[PDB]
Tab-separated table of C-alpha atoms in Angstrom:
chain	number	residue	atom	x	y	z
A	1	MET	CA	35.219	-52.390	-41.334
A	2	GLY	CA	35.461	-48.661	-41.955
A	3	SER	CA	33.420	-45.941	-43.628
A	4	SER	CA	33.263	-42.144	-44.071
A	5	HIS	CA	30.892	-39.316	-44.948
A	6	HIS	CA	30.868	-35.650	-45.963
A	7	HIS	CA	29.234	-32.349	-44.928
A	8	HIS	CA	26.851	-29.949	-46.677
A	9	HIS	CA	26.270	-26.227	-47.213
A	10	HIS	CA	23.436	-23.713	-46.752
A	11	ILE	CA	21.882	-20.775	-48.594
A	12	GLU	CA	21.626	-17.127	-47.587
A	13	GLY	CA	19.303	-15.969	-50.370
A	14	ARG	CA	15.514	-15.962	-50.145
A	15	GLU	CA	14.152	-19.465	-50.714
A	16	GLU	CA	10.886	-21.242	-49.884
A	17	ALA	CA	10.548	-24.190	-47.507
A	18	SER	CA	8.207	-26.764	-45.999
A	19	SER	CA	7.039	-27.979	-42.572
A	20	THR	CA	8.994	-31.172	-43.296
A	21	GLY	CA	11.826	-29.547	-41.372
A	22	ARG	CA	14.016	-27.984	-44.043
A	23	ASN	CA	15.016	-24.356	-43.510
A	24	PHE	CA	11.682	-23.546	-41.869
A	25	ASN	CA	11.168	-20.310	-39.964
A	26	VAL	CA	8.144	-19.985	-37.675
A	27	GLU	CA	9.408	-16.729	-36.188
A	28	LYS	CA	8.292	-15.056	-39.404
A	29	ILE	CA	4.714	-16.298	-39.750
A	30	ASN	CA	4.285	-15.156	-36.140
A	31	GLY	CA	2.124	-12.047	-36.016
A	32	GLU	CA	-1.099	-10.595	-37.453
A	33	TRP	CA	-2.292	-13.008	-40.144
A	34	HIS	CA	-5.047	-12.835	-42.776
A	35	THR	CA	-6.960	-15.158	-45.129
A	36	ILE	CA	-6.245	-14.116	-48.696
A	37	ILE	CA	-7.914	-16.911	-50.665
A	38	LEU	CA	-9.478	-20.232	-49.714
A	39	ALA	CA	-9.127	-23.205	-52.058
A	40	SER	CA	-10.329	-26.740	-51.392
A	41	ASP	CA	-12.151	-29.612	-53.146
A	42	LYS	CA	-15.619	-28.734	-51.811
A	43	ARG	CA	-17.364	-25.663	-53.210
A	44	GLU	CA	-20.284	-26.582	-50.958
A	45	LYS	CA	-17.916	-26.117	-48.019
A	46	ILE	CA	-16.146	-22.846	-48.831
A	47	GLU	CA	-19.327	-21.231	-50.174
A	48	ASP	CA	-21.672	-18.514	-48.870
A	49	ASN	CA	-22.022	-19.120	-45.122
A	50	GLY	CA	-19.995	-22.297	-45.377
A	51	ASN	CA	-18.188	-24.008	-42.486
A	52	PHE	CA	-14.488	-23.536	-43.213
A	53	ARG	CA	-15.024	-20.039	-44.556
A	54	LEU	CA	-13.577	-18.324	-41.473
A	55	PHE	CA	-10.967	-15.616	-40.900
A	56	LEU	CA	-7.535	-16.319	-39.390
A	57	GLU	CA	-6.020	-14.675	-36.334
A	58	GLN	CA	-2.480	-13.985	-35.096
A	59	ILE	CA	-0.791	-17.346	-34.526
A	60	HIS	CA	1.137	-17.608	-31.260
A	61	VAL	CA	4.450	-19.426	-31.804
A	62	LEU	CA	5.343	-21.591	-28.812
A	63	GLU	CA	8.177	-23.937	-27.832
A	64	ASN	CA	6.996	-26.647	-30.233
A	65	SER	CA	3.332	-25.801	-30.757
A	66	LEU	CA	1.456	-22.736	-31.965
A	67	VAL	CA	-1.944	-21.325	-30.959
A	68	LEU	CA	-4.374	-20.106	-33.620
A	69	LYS	CA	-7.831	-18.554	-33.514
A	70	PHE	CA	-10.516	-18.217	-36.183
A	71	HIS	CA	-13.738	-16.275	-36.770
A	72	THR	CA	-16.973	-18.247	-37.113
A	73	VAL	CA	-20.587	-17.154	-36.835
A	74	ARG	CA	-23.381	-19.003	-35.024
A	75	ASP	CA	-27.157	-18.548	-35.291
A	76	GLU	CA	-26.751	-15.433	-37.439
A	77	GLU	CA	-24.376	-14.017	-34.849
A	78	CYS	CA	-20.669	-13.250	-35.213
A	79	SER	CA	-18.334	-15.323	-33.045
A	80	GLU	CA	-14.911	-17.001	-32.787
A	81	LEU	CA	-13.409	-20.267	-31.563
A	82	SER	CA	-10.085	-21.258	-30.012
A	83	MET	CA	-7.643	-23.833	-31.386
A	84	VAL	CA	-4.092	-25.036	-30.717
A	85	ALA	CA	-1.975	-26.650	-33.414
A	86	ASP	CA	0.644	-28.959	-31.882
A	87	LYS	CA	3.274	-31.360	-33.218
A	88	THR	CA	2.981	-35.121	-33.731
A	89	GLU	CA	4.887	-38.267	-34.698
A	90	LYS	CA	4.098	-37.435	-38.328
A	91	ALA	CA	6.523	-35.572	-40.585
A	92	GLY	CA	5.950	-31.835	-40.646
A	93	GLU	CA	2.258	-32.387	-39.859
A	94	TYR	CA	0.719	-30.590	-36.884
A	95	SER	CA	-2.420	-31.825	-35.100
A	96	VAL	CA	-5.222	-29.363	-34.341
A	97	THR	CA	-8.286	-30.196	-32.246
A	98	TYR	CA	-11.051	-29.674	-34.803
A	99	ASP	CA	-14.711	-30.751	-34.919
A	100	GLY	CA	-13.362	-33.911	-36.537
A	101	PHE	CA	-10.162	-35.895	-37.043
A	102	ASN	CA	-7.857	-33.659	-39.086
A	103	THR	CA	-4.256	-32.548	-39.515
A	104	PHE	CA	-2.858	-29.086	-40.208
A	105	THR	CA	0.424	-28.756	-42.123
A	106	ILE	CA	2.420	-26.260	-44.166
A	107	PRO	CA	3.613	-27.371	-47.624
A	108	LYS	CA	4.705	-23.923	-48.826
A	109	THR	CA	6.036	-21.546	-46.194
A	110	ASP	CA	6.814	-18.244	-47.881
A	111	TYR	CA	6.249	-15.881	-44.968
A	112	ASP	CA	8.490	-13.494	-46.905
A	113	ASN	CA	5.652	-12.892	-49.347
A	114	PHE	CA	2.712	-15.300	-48.936
A	115	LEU	CA	2.293	-18.278	-46.593
A	116	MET	CA	0.638	-21.556	-47.614
A	117	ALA	CA	-0.958	-24.223	-45.428
A	118	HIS	CA	-2.535	-27.628	-46.096
A	119	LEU	CA	-5.043	-29.203	-43.684
A	120	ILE	CA	-7.123	-32.346	-44.187
A	121	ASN	CA	-10.106	-33.450	-42.128
A	122	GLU	CA	-11.676	-36.920	-42.336
A	123	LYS	CA	-15.113	-37.074	-40.704
A	124	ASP	CA	-18.451	-38.735	-41.461
A	125	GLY	CA	-16.647	-41.256	-43.633
A	126	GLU	CA	-15.666	-38.340	-45.879
A	127	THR	CA	-12.540	-36.208	-46.166
A	128	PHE	CA	-11.348	-33.174	-48.130
A	129	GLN	CA	-8.103	-31.305	-48.792
A	130	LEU	CA	-8.297	-27.815	-47.279
A	131	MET	CA	-5.747	-25.097	-48.071
A	132	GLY	CA	-5.801	-21.569	-46.722
A	133	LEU	CA	-3.572	-19.066	-48.504
A	134	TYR	CA	-2.154	-16.341	-46.295
A	135	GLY	CA	-0.133	-13.195	-46.938
A	136	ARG	CA	1.646	-10.385	-45.122
A	137	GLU	CA	-1.124	-8.153	-46.433
A	138	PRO	CA	-4.935	-8.487	-46.299
A	139	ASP	CA	-4.885	-8.796	-50.110
A	140	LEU	CA	-2.611	-10.491	-52.631
A	141	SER	CA	-1.738	-9.231	-56.088
A	142	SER	CA	-2.526	-11.100	-59.321
A	143	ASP	CA	1.075	-12.311	-59.398
A	144	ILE	CA	0.955	-14.101	-56.039
A	145	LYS	CA	-2.687	-15.261	-56.056
A	146	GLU	CA	-1.812	-17.074	-59.277
A	147	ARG	CA	1.014	-18.953	-57.577
A	148	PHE	CA	-1.432	-20.800	-55.326
A	149	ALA	CA	-3.601	-21.668	-58.318
A	150	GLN	CA	-0.574	-23.558	-59.613
A	151	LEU	CA	-0.538	-25.856	-56.576
A	152	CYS	CA	-4.293	-26.261	-56.211
A	153	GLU	CA	-4.220	-28.127	-59.532
A	154	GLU	CA	-1.537	-30.465	-58.179
A	155	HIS	CA	-3.653	-31.409	-55.159
A	156	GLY	CA	-6.555	-32.184	-57.480
A	157	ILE	CA	-8.292	-28.929	-56.558
A	158	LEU	CA	-9.387	-27.503	-59.877
A	159	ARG	CA	-8.587	-23.815	-60.386
A	160	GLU	CA	-12.344	-23.275	-60.483
A	161	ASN	CA	-12.674	-24.550	-56.922
A	162	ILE	CA	-10.683	-21.516	-55.843
A	163	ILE	CA	-12.941	-19.112	-53.933
A	164	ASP	CA	-11.933	-15.457	-53.516
A	165	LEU	CA	-12.293	-14.068	-49.992
A	166	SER	CA	-10.912	-10.578	-50.600
A	167	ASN	CA	-14.114	-9.931	-52.531
A	168	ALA	CA	-16.422	-11.914	-50.238
A	169	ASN	CA	-16.842	-10.451	-46.746
A	170	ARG	CA	-19.890	-10.569	-44.468
A	171	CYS	CA	-21.230	-11.816	-41.140
A	172	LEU	CA	-24.819	-12.592	-42.127
A	173	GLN	CA	-26.839	-14.892	-44.386
A	174	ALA	CA	-29.110	-12.244	-45.882
A	175	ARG	CA	-30.290	-12.684	-49.482
A	176	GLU	CA	-33.277	-12.957	-51.812
């Protein structure tokens, strides 16, 4: 018998990555975060006073896991919950303790400009693909916000299902 192999090279320039474990940097995403735009197949979910329509906090990068907090109201009263996204046997898919069985991952990690995450929750015999677009700033330009719209169509999430958050901000359910 007898075999042989070869080596590989790396890149220094700015290039995207995924949670799969290929040139991923969590030391960047670490810090004050913000929810630019929320896109997911479920307008009735990410709508006025929805359930997933919550703000993001500063993720705390740990040894292998990372803590994350959100902002959710209750009984017409502002509030916030506590979560902790950890690793699992899966491939580049973290597991966060949510109201129902779900998994938080990161398909497009462009901390340099805008970060992208993909979480799916399957409860009540029903599931949906959730994706929260994040960016170094509290608002993304028309050049970056469009980038996400290119992926939403790939996940089956029509560009129309994209709900703008930068324009929608409130902590009450007041209306006519």
